Amino acid sequence: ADLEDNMETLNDNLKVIEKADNAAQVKDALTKMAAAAADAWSATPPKLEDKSPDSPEMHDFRHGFWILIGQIHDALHLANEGKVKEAQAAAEQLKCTCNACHQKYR
Amino acid sequence: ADLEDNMETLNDNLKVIEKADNAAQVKDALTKMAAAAADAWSATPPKLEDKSPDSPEMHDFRHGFWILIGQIHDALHLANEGKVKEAQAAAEQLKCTCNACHQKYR
Amino acid sequence: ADLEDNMETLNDNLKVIEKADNAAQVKDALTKMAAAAADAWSATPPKLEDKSPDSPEMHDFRHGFWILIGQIHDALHLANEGKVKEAQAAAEQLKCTCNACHQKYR
Amino acid sequence: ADLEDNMETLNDNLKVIEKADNAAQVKDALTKMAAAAADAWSATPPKLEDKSPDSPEMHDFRHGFWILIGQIHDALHLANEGKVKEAQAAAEQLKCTCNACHQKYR
Ligand code: HEM
Ligand code: HEM
Ligand code: HEM
Ligand code: HEM
């Protein structure tokens, strides 16, 4: 999938999580977010297309995805233990990772 | 100090940073923020007064200040290096941390 | 307490954790480790005594303690939920933070 | 690849890095490590074959490779900047991550 596609995926499932009222539905969305983040990890953003694939910018870019992934994985674990509220709380702070990368490269 | 008092010094100094011209000003502001963040770290917010001090909520609450502190110290480092534009971009970014805890617990 | 004192404290309770067979004893040691790490956070190490309190070295030094603290806090939470095994596993990885700082500044 | 096969490429390339003279060599070694780490990320180790794929153990197991990966990429960045001594100090440091997972799950 393209970056925009993964981003929309991240966005959609994020919304599902905020409303879900059962662990089953949160686990499903998080797994799906993990997949999208894993795929965007290697994408080259428009604003950085003119940079070295090994530039400080791209390294920081990929670093954001490595962070997000860790956070999604951490949240998925909480959901697996059936802690919907905690899982949901984790997703709120996770938004900050989304936002930090956007401020820099969107 | 009061949670309300600590929050006021955090909010006022963030503004000082967003308007700052030099490093002395940003450094002084971040320094006061660090102190307010450190003092707030052990507070119990109104909406969690009936929760166990060891609840996931309270653990997550304390985690938020732990994050904020790390973010202020890093911003402070950027400032100590005369990196104003960078320190300010850092202060702007940590706003999301403020927002995340407010959404869940304010 | 002096740095050496906190270090010995960190060391001792670390050993208690590895052997404890009940959550009560792990919670007690972790709380105590948290206290010692919090205190060493501000200490100036022998090898860095000739550096600027705001030098890259000291910033990285303090950063290690901020990491450790977060990890201890995370482990204490697991112990509070009564997950001795998980708590104990957390402490093993935590050792790496101890070791990373020592390699650099001990 | 096999967990044993991936572990052999991780161990052999670490040695190559410890003996390296230039960046080309370290970079090539770290690159192969990243690939082996990425492939191992989803393995189930012998001592956890009877555990649920969602157990805290397995979640912690996957977390270890998540850490390792972040450490190899950072080391790789140091290498891509011709920072050999630094890339090597980084490779030496991540050994503890290897050690931590072995202690718990090998
Ligand atoms: C879970 C967190 C995230 C959410 C909810 C999210 C959501 C979005 C959305 C809705 C868009 C709008 C454009 C579209 O998809 O049509 C977008 C764009 C973008 N995001 Fe994210 N995003 C997240 C995390 C990240 C991270 C961590 C990075 C960087 C490491 C990143 C980099 C970008 C970039 C570069 C764009 C612009 C893509 C383009 O040129 O069309 N995003 N994101
Ligand atoms: C740099 C970030 C922060 C800023 C600028 C900020 C700002 C504020 C402001 C303006 C208020 C309302 C007025 C006041 O109470 O003085 C407030 C309230 C509050 N903040 Fe923050 N805040 C920050 C971070 C945080 C963090 C990270 C947490 C939790 C971990 C938090 C928890 C709260 C709570 C619970 C209240 C309600 C307090 C009450 O009802 O008495 N804040 N904050
Ligand atoms: C929980 C993890 C840790 C444990 C178990 C631990 C244990 C120890 C021990 C046993 C010593 C031997 C000297 C003595 O205390 O008599 C020591 C020394 C030292 N550690 Fe740690 N330590 C830990 C974390 C850290 C961290 C994260 C840093 C840096 C951020 C650090 C910095 C130092 C330094 C500078 C010394 C030398 C102190 C001196 O000059 O005597 N330690 N540590
Ligand atoms: C850079 C770090 C690493 C190095 C150099 C390393 C090296 C090795 C070596 C030499 C072996 C024994 C020989 C072999 O199986 O080929 C091994 C086995 C093993 N390693 Fe690692 N390893 C690393 C990281 C990790 C990590 C982080 C984990 C877990 C998250 C892990 C889990 C295991 C397991 C379970 C075995 C036993 C496999 C079996 O019984 O088939 N290793 N490793």
JSON list of C-alpha atoms and ligand atoms in Angstrom, two decimals, chain A residues 93, chain B residues 2-15 33 37 40-41 44-48 60-69 71-72 91 94-106, ligand 2:
[
{"chain": "A", "resi": 93, "resn": "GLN", "atom": "CA", "xyz": [-0.66, 9.10, 23.84]},
{"chain": "B", "resi": 2, "resn": "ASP", "atom": "CA", "xyz": [-1.10, 22.74, 43.85]},
{"chain": "B", "resi": 3, "resn": "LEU", "atom": "CA", "xyz": [-1.77, 20.87, 40.62]},
{"chain": "B", "resi": 4, "resn": "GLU", "atom": "CA", "xyz": [-3.55, 24.06, 39.47]},
{"chain": "B", "resi": 5, "resn": "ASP", "atom": "CA", "xyz": [-0.55, 26.17, 40.45]},
{"chain": "B", "resi": 6, "resn": "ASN", "atom": "CA", "xyz": [1.89, 23.84, 38.70]},
{"chain": "B", "resi": 7, "resn": "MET", "atom": "CA", "xyz": [-0.28, 23.78, 35.56]},
{"chain": "B", "resi": 8, "resn": "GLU", "atom": "CA", "xyz": [-0.33, 27.58, 35.48]},
{"chain": "B", "resi": 9, "resn": "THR", "atom": "CA", "xyz": [3.43, 27.84, 35.53]},
{"chain": "B", "resi": 10, "resn": "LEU", "atom": "CA", "xyz": [3.69, 25.19, 32.80]},
{"chain": "B", "resi": 11, "resn": "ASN", "atom": "CA", "xyz": [1.16, 27.05, 30.58]},
{"chain": "B", "resi": 12, "resn": "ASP", "atom": "CA", "xyz": [2.61, 30.52, 31.15]},
{"chain": "B", "resi": 13, "resn": "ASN", "atom": "CA", "xyz": [6.18, 29.47, 30.46]},
{"chain": "B", "resi": 14, "resn": "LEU", "atom": "CA", "xyz": [5.20, 27.63, 27.30]},
{"chain": "B", "resi": 15, "resn": "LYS", "atom": "CA", "xyz": [3.86, 30.99, 26.03]},
{"chain": "B", "resi": 33, "resn": "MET", "atom": "CA", "xyz": [8.68, 24.10, 33.65]},
{"chain": "B", "resi": 37, "resn": "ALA", "atom": "CA", "xyz": [6.57, 19.17, 36.09]},
{"chain": "B", "resi": 40, "resn": "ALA", "atom": "CA", "xyz": [3.22, 17.76, 39.76]},
{"chain": "B", "resi": 41, "resn": "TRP", "atom": "CA", "xyz": [4.64, 14.28, 39.11]},
{"chain": "B", "resi": 44, "resn": "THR", "atom": "CA", "xyz": [-3.43, 13.00, 42.51]},
{"chain": "B", "resi": 45, "resn": "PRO", "atom": "CA", "xyz": [-5.88, 14.66, 40.10]},
{"chain": "B", "resi": 46, "resn": "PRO", "atom": "CA", "xyz": [-9.53, 15.29, 41.03]},
{"chain": "B", "resi": 47, "resn": "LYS", "atom": "CA", "xyz": [-10.82, 12.71, 38.57]},
{"chain": "B", "resi": 48, "resn": "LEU", "atom": "CA", "xyz": [-8.67, 9.97, 40.05]},
{"chain": "B", "resi": 60, "resn": "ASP", "atom": "CA", "xyz": [-0.43, 6.20, 33.50]},
{"chain": "B", "resi": 61, "resn": "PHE", "atom": "CA", "xyz": [-0.92, 9.66, 35.00]},
{"chain": "B", "resi": 62, "resn": "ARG", "atom": "CA", "xyz": [2.59, 9.57, 36.52]},
{"chain": "B", "resi": 63, "resn": "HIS", "atom": "CA", "xyz": [3.89, 8.19, 33.25]},
{"chain": "B", "resi": 64, "resn": "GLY", "atom": "CA", "xyz": [2.66, 11.34, 31.44]},
{"chain": "B", "resi": 65, "resn": "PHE", "atom": "CA", "xyz": [4.76, 13.64, 33.63]},
{"chain": "B", "resi": 66, "resn": "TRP", "atom": "CA", "xyz": [7.68, 11.24, 33.22]},
{"chain": "B", "resi": 67, "resn": "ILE", "atom": "CA", "xyz": [7.36, 11.81, 29.46]},
{"chain": "B", "resi": 68, "resn": "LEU", "atom": "CA", "xyz": [6.90, 15.56, 29.82]},
{"chain": "B", "resi": 69, "resn": "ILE", "atom": "CA", "xyz": [9.98, 15.84, 32.00]},
{"chain": "B", "resi": 71, "resn": "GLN", "atom": "CA", "xyz": [10.77, 16.36, 26.83]},
{"chain": "B", "resi": 72, "resn": "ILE", "atom": "CA", "xyz": [11.50, 19.51, 28.83]},
{"chain": "B", "resi": 91, "resn": "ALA", "atom": "CA", "xyz": [8.46, 22.97, 23.22]},
{"chain": "B", "resi": 94, "resn": "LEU", "atom": "CA", "xyz": [5.61, 18.46, 23.85]},
{"chain": "B", "resi": 95, "resn": "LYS", "atom": "CA", "xyz": [2.27, 20.31, 23.88]},
{"chain": "B", "resi": 96, "resn": "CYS", "atom": "CA", "xyz": [0.75, 17.08, 22.68]},
{"chain": "B", "resi": 97, "resn": "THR", "atom": "CA", "xyz": [1.85, 15.38, 25.90]},
{"chain": "B", "resi": 98, "resn": "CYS", "atom": "CA", "xyz": [0.01, 18.07, 27.84]},
{"chain": "B", "resi": 99, "resn": "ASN", "atom": "CA", "xyz": [-3.01, 17.45, 25.61]},
{"chain": "B", "resi": 100, "resn": "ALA", "atom": "CA", "xyz": [-2.92, 13.67, 25.98]},
{"chain": "B", "resi": 101, "resn": "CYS", "atom": "CA", "xyz": [-3.04, 13.72, 29.77]},
{"chain": "B", "resi": 102, "resn": "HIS", "atom": "CA", "xyz": [-5.80, 16.37, 29.76]},
{"chain": "B", "resi": 103, "resn": "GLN", "atom": "CA", "xyz": [-7.95, 14.28, 27.41]},
{"chain": "B", "resi": 104, "resn": "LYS", "atom": "CA", "xyz": [-7.74, 11.28, 29.72]},
{"chain": "B", "resi": 105, "resn": "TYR", "atom": "CA", "xyz": [-7.63, 12.81, 33.14]},
{"chain": "B", "resi": 106, "resn": "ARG", "atom": "CA", "xyz": [-8.62, 16.46, 33.15]},
{"chain": "E", "resi": 2, "resn": "HEM", "atom": "C1", "xyz": [3.39, 21.23, 29.03]},
{"chain": "E", "resi": 2, "resn": "HEM", "atom": "C2", "xyz": [2.18, 20.64, 29.28]},
{"chain": "E", "resi": 2, "resn": "HEM", "atom": "C3", "xyz": [1.15, 21.17, 30.11]},
{"chain": "E", "resi": 2, "resn": "HEM", "atom": "C4", "xyz": [0.52, 22.37, 30.09]},
{"chain": "E", "resi": 2, "resn": "HEM", "atom": "C5", "xyz": [0.99, 23.65, 29.33]},
{"chain": "E", "resi": 2, "resn": "HEM", "atom": "C6", "xyz": [-0.68, 22.28, 30.89]},
{"chain": "E", "resi": 2, "resn": "HEM", "atom": "C7", "xyz": [-1.62, 23.33, 31.12]},
{"chain": "E", "resi": 2, "resn": "HEM", "atom": "C8", "xyz": [-2.72, 23.22, 31.92]},
{"chain": "E", "resi": 2, "resn": "HEM", "atom": "C9", "xyz": [-3.69, 24.29, 32.16]},
{"chain": "E", "resi": 2, "resn": "HEM", "atom": "C10", "xyz": [-3.71, 25.68, 31.57]},
{"chain": "E", "resi": 2, "resn": "HEM", "atom": "C11", "xyz": [-4.66, 23.75, 32.98]},
{"chain": "E", "resi": 2, "resn": "HEM", "atom": "C12", "xyz": [-5.92, 24.51, 33.41]},
{"chain": "E", "resi": 2, "resn": "HEM", "atom": "C13", "xyz": [-5.61, 25.68, 34.34]},
{"chain": "E", "resi": 2, "resn": "HEM", "atom": "C14", "xyz": [-4.92, 25.25, 35.61]},
{"chain": "E", "resi": 2, "resn": "HEM", "atom": "O1", "xyz": [-5.33, 24.21, 36.18]},
{"chain": "E", "resi": 2, "resn": "HEM", "atom": "O2", "xyz": [-3.98, 25.93, 36.05]},
{"chain": "E", "resi": 2, "resn": "HEM", "atom": "C15", "xyz": [-4.28, 22.37, 33.26]},
{"chain": "E", "resi": 2, "resn": "HEM", "atom": "C16", "xyz": [-5.03, 21.47, 34.05]},
{"chain": "E", "resi": 2, "resn": "HEM", "atom": "C17", "xyz": [-4.72, 20.12, 34.27]},
{"chain": "E", "resi": 2, "resn": "HEM", "atom": "N1", "xyz": [-3.58, 19.44, 33.72]},
{"chain": "E", "resi": 2, "resn": "HEM", "atom": "FE1", "xyz": [-2.18, 20.21, 32.62]},
{"chain": "E", "resi": 2, "resn": "HEM", "atom": "N2", "xyz": [-0.80, 21.08, 31.46]},
{"chain": "E", "resi": 2, "resn": "HEM", "atom": "C18", "xyz": [0.31, 20.38, 31.00]},
{"chain": "E", "resi": 2, "resn": "HEM", "atom": "C19", "xyz": [0.56, 19.05, 31.24]},
{"chain": "E", "resi": 2, "resn": "HEM", "atom": "C20", "xyz": [-0.16, 18.12, 31.92]},
{"chain": "E", "resi": 2, "resn": "HEM", "atom": "C21", "xyz": [0.21, 16.66, 32.05]},
{"chain": "E", "resi": 2, "resn": "HEM", "atom": "C22", "xyz": [1.30, 15.96, 31.25]},
{"chain": "E", "resi": 2, "resn": "HEM", "atom": "C23", "xyz": [-0.73, 16.07, 32.85]},
{"chain": "E", "resi": 2, "resn": "HEM", "atom": "C24", "xyz": [-0.85, 14.74, 33.36]},
{"chain": "E", "resi": 2, "resn": "HEM", "atom": "C25", "xyz": [0.20, 13.75, 33.30]},
{"chain": "E", "resi": 2, "resn": "HEM", "atom": "C26", "xyz": [-1.69, 17.22, 33.16]},
{"chain": "E", "resi": 2, "resn": "HEM", "atom": "C27", "xyz": [-2.84, 17.13, 33.92]},
{"chain": "E", "resi": 2, "resn": "HEM", "atom": "C28", "xyz": [-3.73, 18.16, 34.20]},
{"chain": "E", "resi": 2, "resn": "HEM", "atom": "C29", "xyz": [-4.91, 18.05, 35.03]},
{"chain": "E", "resi": 2, "resn": "HEM", "atom": "C30", "xyz": [-5.49, 16.80, 35.73]},
{"chain": "E", "resi": 2, "resn": "HEM", "atom": "C31", "xyz": [-5.54, 19.22, 35.07]},
{"chain": "E", "resi": 2, "resn": "HEM", "atom": "C32", "xyz": [-6.87, 19.45, 35.89]},
{"chain": "E", "resi": 2, "resn": "HEM", "atom": "C33", "xyz": [-6.41, 19.96, 37.24]},
{"chain": "E", "resi": 2, "resn": "HEM", "atom": "C34", "xyz": [-7.56, 20.34, 38.16]},
{"chain": "E", "resi": 2, "resn": "HEM", "atom": "O3", "xyz": [-8.72, 20.05, 37.82]},
{"chain": "E", "resi": 2, "resn": "HEM", "atom": "O4", "xyz": [-7.29, 20.93, 39.23]},
{"chain": "E", "resi": 2, "resn": "HEM", "atom": "N3", "xyz": [-1.30, 18.39, 32.57]},
{"chain": "E", "resi": 2, "resn": "HEM", "atom": "N4", "xyz": [-3.10, 22.05, 32.60]}
]
